[PDB]
């Protein structure tokens, strides 16, 4: 039992100790320092503080809200079942407070040194705030003057003490909502708002208990507003809900309870509830407000790059027929989504940019033969040295005759090569073009128009000719099949024509290497006829 | 003590001071440019400056806090203590006025030329609004007269002239609370919104003398508000009270004090007065927000890149299970907190960077052997050239036969290597891989799988090849340390094997060069077998 | 003068002007372009429609003040002094009208285009919401019942057809207010508010007519608040103060005028109130929280980036120790002025920013002798390849030994040089160290400590070579003035002793090259000693 008691006490495994700590042999190693000192330290983030933290709010909310309504309207405040659960609360925060002093704090590291640092910092923080709210003043106040009616008044106010074990409340609240309300954006605000209305009907109800608190200390004299309803004799449901639709009335600044306030007090207290209420429905318009741009963040950010863009267009002064192929085009790339994909992938790292490439990319290197002939360090390598495009019906993506710097992998939508002397070339999804402008460091060979939206992979020079560099058996394969591919459009370039011939007269071609080869043509044959 | 005047004259050495002129240099020059005029000229940095501003601040509450009281409900206003008050603040607002004279004012630099500059300067600016509230014209008038219920109304509505005395108060809050206000975000929040509710509660009071005033001014018409609550007689506390709460009730736009006002001057006033109050609710309501808006910054902005990266995944259309890895990783990288590194490290300077990095990794030139023994200079700087990186468990950070392009630091999480024909090698916390990748020119030697959550920190190739040409004895360490590992591994690299051949028999190591090889080769052992 | 009316239709030169067309060029054309067509057309920028608009403006808001008010409380409306204030505002905004027909608008290009284009565009647009409230319709239905009390009620009625001429003040508001309001930020704001409140004003002033004109059509009701009240008989004064009170109050939702509204017509209306002014009171608190966050701005954002910087160094748990030295760091660079300095110097072009560096650097161009003689285009490169830099006091700048990277020339706060075999050596304002290491291309000679809080400017060593390497007579000068330092320091530059030994018996020094080379060293000498 006693050894549950100390795993109990010690820090344990959990996803905010995950966050704190890094990896588990700090959370080892915090077992260890939680295990110096002897049978008597707990942990800030134990299982054992975090559940009396939610023992101790659940009773300082039932406490709080029976307090103040047990003083005012119940004059007959020595009833057996009225001092058993005082003194069942009172007894309940003295543990609370004794275990205040053998808890522990975190400045920098978790502080656990006891008899001195928690101690010392403890006493000099909040013992006094604690220590009048926890012991039963009333009691001891009342056993004095017994070892009169001032001093049932007397008696009947001190009570009001324990209203310090307020600051408990939030003190504890502080921790517990900023564990348990880090998960997503819709329950953290709902959570606030509904703490701070929570908040909000305390109050009502304290100030609903103060405005029959003071006329009752006085006896209710001629011209408050009690004996000026008549309402001295109502029994006590009746005398609460008007005391506290007086209070929500001035809270929310409807109108005073009565026509007016006669009485000095009355009228005092009138206005202090009033700008009680004033300031408090001041804060709650303003939390409201964050809540509310809290949450329409993105079509916010988005709104935004959509005027910037709208701003360019017009300082430019475009016809309204390029803003409409503008905004076409934000649509058919962006999709509404507003995003840094460069920086984001530059924060991950290289396994995750990996994975992720791969799963963005896992259609084309099952339709390409290539890709799925070829070594996965290759073709993790050429994967990684991407980039995206998005290409709109009836623009030249390769105009004929121009210098060549970059190859596309198309991904989605047919795209047509228009060659002089031929009729058309369509290339579906799962195809390549500026294979041979590459590998011969020339122009052009013949302009590719796109025909239906097309959602292109483009890949520039200087990565393929590292990539080719590094592994050139796939610069083998890319000289035969931009041969075959040249062959069948009409030109033919004479330097891949002797390198290849110098090549393949040198003997490094072997006869798996040739059959993946022929495989490879007639696959070639085959997404050029479909 | 004149010297102690001038020196309180001067500027004095103090934060502000600093801010304003960088080295102390320019506070002996602005020290001598205050020297230069005699017994006369006071700086607006200096001390004086700024106890006269806080102590003509604390008479200048007072003074319009008891002003319009007094005037409204003192109908005996001759009286020697209301004189005697009334004569010293006089004589210390024309004492401030003199001061005004004699100070100086900050364009650019601070202008100090009295005869002519600040002097015209002045009396362009302010002098018509301070010299109206400075006098008693309430005397001055009186005995001109003397030398009558009418002119006791004249003489009652004079003082308020005094009410012209709230302009110097907002002209040097604005200098007080930007010197006093810059410290934190919490106390210079709080300091501006109890400025706000003082401001408040400054006209509520105003307001409530002027209901009062009104209905004094016609000697209490038979059907104003005064004389149908029937309080002509009744003691001043009462009546102040009232219209108190009057103004407060229309302020914060409760009710009216009675059922209605029917007298036309009660009814334009109420009206204006509601206008000041709706005003006035509005500013505090945009001031609640924008506080509220500057308190909760850093949570929001957190949000803020979440969004954008879920964002980012929804259009990739990832599935879960990468997801769940993704926020896992940024989790277990940024631990909840949103900041830019590069930026930062670039905004701060050479020795900044070099102790905020040697604090950063004062584990591992502890650990590490090489760190310990080698020069501080070659020690900075490639503790300079190092990145940061976070490794989830069970992905493979360098595989096999890939081309090598960085090496890794382990700082925290055991990662494993993974050789064919070898069970398995763990590397605690201390240790490095990718010497001999980057050593050789070539392809990896072993694969490494991250098991715990590792890390790292990583050295590209680029500046591991300018740190170790720039200093050759570490690459003779790395070498040695290299040839040993690959021995024990199985592999065997004939190009590092030739060069450190030719290296050792060329005679330039020594006899504690290699003591120190041999300590760190043993080294090596140990924090391989652990 | 037909002269002066061409030109004051046609558009002048102004700052809006210059705004919109770029060069005078642009002017011109456009005041040709008004010249095509003759004796009509006026131009939506020229002083003729601004001073239209203005007059138009004035007048307006003084008929939507005095409107409403002479409808309901004047059932004598057929007096001779308001018929002739009747007719002159009517043939002003037919006046009015006309000239709205034979102006021009902006939609992309001024159209221009008078017969069809702007004739139809402007008879499409707002022709019928003007010509209602442009003629007096109340005459013209008069003279057709002429040629009774339900007539008289209709001829009551249909004058509110002329509070359509509030959209033409709105929509010529928005054209003044955009040109008369881009000066600064405060006056745009407190105008932007005052215009809100004006607004607010006159529908409190149009709601305060109301609720007496439809009591007054049913010819008062013996249940309706006016023959509650008993003031069907009070002069006009007090019933329009006793209405617009009760429409104030609605307004800003104080309470009801009377203890309540009986019938249904003041019951309807009570209400329609009630939603426009809460609706209008939000309006006008979501106008006020923007104004406070505009106005609010640059001490936020200076918080976000320290706030940034304070959870850095949270994350790297960091001692107090350094943080205080961060801290320090920052006011002492930024001096709480949050800017991004290289953006706003990349927008700026080429002159600007050799403007903005002279001046930024004309002290050290005056105390350095080096630039005091040197060739102006030579000067002015080598000033712009600099950076601003800050040292806080007692860190090395340049440490002994470690390879050079930079030089830098000092601009306030002494630096020491810190040689062995040497005492000290300060070096005051408008200096320069760093030379002889990028000269030799070797390791630094002796460190230097930074005493004071050194602000430093210092260059780079590329563009240090690509300078020195585009005019070498400076380069000699820094040979010879590196070589009289190294020889009083103590370490001797064998390289630089052999270039020079070459290049002075070369013979391409001159008199007075060496005149001015032994005025450069002894004040190196002077600048060494001071
Ligand atoms: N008949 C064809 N079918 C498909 N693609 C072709 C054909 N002819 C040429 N191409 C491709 O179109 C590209 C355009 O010019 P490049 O020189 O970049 O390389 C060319 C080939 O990749
Ligand atoms: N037996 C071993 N123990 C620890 N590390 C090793 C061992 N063998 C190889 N390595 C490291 O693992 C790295 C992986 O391949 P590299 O060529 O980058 O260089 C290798 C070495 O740094
Ligand atoms: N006696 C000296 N007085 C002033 N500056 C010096 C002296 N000796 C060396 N320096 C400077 O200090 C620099 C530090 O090393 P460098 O090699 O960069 O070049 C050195 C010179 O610019």
């Known amino acids: 039992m006693q050894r549950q008691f100390t795993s109990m006490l010690q820090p344990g495994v959990n996803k905010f100790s995950l966050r704190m700590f890094g990896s588990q042999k700090a959370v080892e190693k915090e077992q260890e320092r939680v295990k110096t ?11 054992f503080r975090f559940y009396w933290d939610l023992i101790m709010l659940i009773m300082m909310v039932g406490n709080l809200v029976i307090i103040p309504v047990g003083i005012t309207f119940f004059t007959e405040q020595t009833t057996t079942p009225w001092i058993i659960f005082n003194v069942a609360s009172d007894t309940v925060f003295l543990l609370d407070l004794i275990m205040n002093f053998r808890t522990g704090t975190v400045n920098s590291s978790e502080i656990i040194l006891d008899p001195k640092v928690i101690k010392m910092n403890y006493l000099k923080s909040w013992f006094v705030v604690d220590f009048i709210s926890s012991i ?4 001891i106040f009342l056993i004095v003057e017994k070892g009169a009616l001032r001093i049932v008044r007397f008696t009947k106010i001190l009570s009001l003490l324990r209203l310090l074990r307020l600051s408990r409340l939030i003190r504890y609240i502080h921790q517990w909502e900023e564990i348990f309300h880090m998960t997503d954006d819709l329950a953290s605000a709902v959570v606030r708002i509904f703490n701070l209305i929570g908040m909000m009907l305390l109050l009502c109800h304290w100030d609903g208990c103060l405005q029959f608190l003071v006329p009752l200390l006085q006896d209710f004299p001629p011209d408050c507003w009690v004996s000026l309803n008549e309402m001295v004799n109502d029994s006590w449901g009746k005398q609460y809900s008007y005391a506290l639709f007086k209070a929500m009335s001035h809270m929310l600044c409807i109108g005073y309870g009565a026509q007016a306030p006669v009485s000095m007090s009355d009228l005092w207290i009138t206005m202090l509830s009033m700008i009680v209420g004033a300031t408090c429905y001041a804060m709650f318009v303003g939390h409201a407000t964050a809540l509310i741009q809290s949450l329409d963040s993105s079509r916010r950010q988005y709104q935004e790059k959509y005027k910037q863009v709208e701003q360019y267009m017009s300082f430019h002064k475009l016809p309204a027929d390029m803003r409409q192929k503008i905004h076409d085009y934000y649509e058919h790339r962006y999709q509404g989504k507003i995003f840094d994909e460069e920086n984001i992938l530059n924060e991950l790292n290289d396994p995750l ?24 360090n290759f073709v993790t390598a050429m994967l990684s040295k991407l980039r995206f495009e998005v290409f709109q019906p009836g623009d030249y993506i390769i105009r004929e005759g ?21 009729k058309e070339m369509k290339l579906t999804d799962g195809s390549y073009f500026g294979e041979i402008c590459l590998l011969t460091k020339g122009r052009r060979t013949a302009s590719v128009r796109a025909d239906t939206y097309c959602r292109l992979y483009s890949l ?16 083998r394969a890319f000289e035969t099949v ?12 004479s330097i891949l024509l002797q390198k290849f011939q110098k090549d393949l007269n040198t003997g490094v071609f072997n006869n798996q290497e040739n059959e993946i080869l022929k495989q490879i043509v007639k696959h070639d044959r085959e997404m050029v006829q479909a």
């Open 402 to 422: 121009a210098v060549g710097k970059k190859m596309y992998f198309i991904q989605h939508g047919v795209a047509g090569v228009i060659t002089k002397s031929s």
């Open 482 to 493: 931009a041969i075959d591919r040249l062959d069948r459009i009409g030109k033919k370039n």
């Open 353 to 376: 940019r990996e994975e992720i490439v791969n799963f963005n990319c896992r259609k084309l290197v099952a339709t390409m033969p290539l890709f799925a002939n070829a070594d996965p």
């Open 37 to 47: 000192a002897g049978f008597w330290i707990i942990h800030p983030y134990s299982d």
């Open 460 to 475: 520039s020079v200087d990565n393929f000719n590292e990539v080719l560099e590094e592994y050139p058996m796939m610069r």
């Open 136 to 139: 039963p003043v009333d009691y």
